[PDB]
């Protein structure tokens with residue numbers, strides 16, 4: 676990794692230009708992110724013990740489905756031209772809806788990235804669609820490893836709309852990453868945010884119970900902003916999401932099984 680000076684990265688971001696159309700993209704995991712440059716190589720600058728673990732994980736953990744760390748001073752990464760899966764599911768800033776075909780590759784790519792992390796005995800601890808970034812080919816890239824660990828804790832961290840019941844109780848397990856990935860799969864099927872105060876149910880993970888109790892079908896919840904979804908592959912992704920969302924952690928599939936079920940889907 677390239678060691679930058681805080682004054683080097685100041686110029687690349689036009690004196691940390693906070694005005695968006697400027698250089699500010701938005702806030703992201705304990706800091707702000709700005710669009711910067713290193714010749715033509717467009718970069719993302721993360722203006723934040725806390726930032727020392729990110730480099731500690733990014734060092735050994737190199738994979739096609741993980742964001743690439745370039746250097747630091749601030750943390751610098753290759754700028755993902757298609758931003759977050761969360762923003763792309765909401766068509767933020769006029770972007771066209773993602774097709775079912777694109778959603779399947781993104782789901783498969785995100786699962787490959789989690790598999791690499793679990794193979795290398797790491798727990799992400801904050802799997803969510805805001806942390807799934809998309810490159811030039813809409814390849815899924817897992818980001819924000821600040822909370823990542825390589826068990827119980829007093830400092831409960833994560834996004835509550837995505838957290839497993841045992842994670843909300845203080846447990847640290849890769850099985851909690853599977854539950855959170857289940858919430859991501861529902862966001863992909865439905866195009867709905869994981870939590871919405873203006874909704875019944877308020878939490879997306881609660882549609883699992885609604886379908887199980889036959890008050891609604893998966894077909895009632897399929898994102899209407901696609902024209903290429905087929906009931907077979909949609910029900911097959913929903914089946915993976917449902918298995919990931921088991922209240923009991925040990926009943927949940929491991930990432931390799933999830934990866935295998937998503938591969939069988941296409």
Ligand SMILES: COC(=O)N1CCN([C@H]2CC[C@H](Nc3nc(Nc4cnn(C)c4)nc4ccn(CC#N)c(=O)c34)CC2)CC1
Pocket residue numbers: 700701702703708719720721742750752753754755756757758759762767808818819
């Ligand atoms: C209502 O609008 C809002 O306030 N929003 C909109 C903006 N949204 C976020 C803001 C943070 C963005 N983070 C990133 N973006 C981009 N590229 C990019 C964003 N947008 N586009 C078009 C292209 N590349 C990278 C590369 C690496 N890392 C790792 C780190 N550190 C990133 O985080 C990263 C993701 C979208 C939040 C809510």
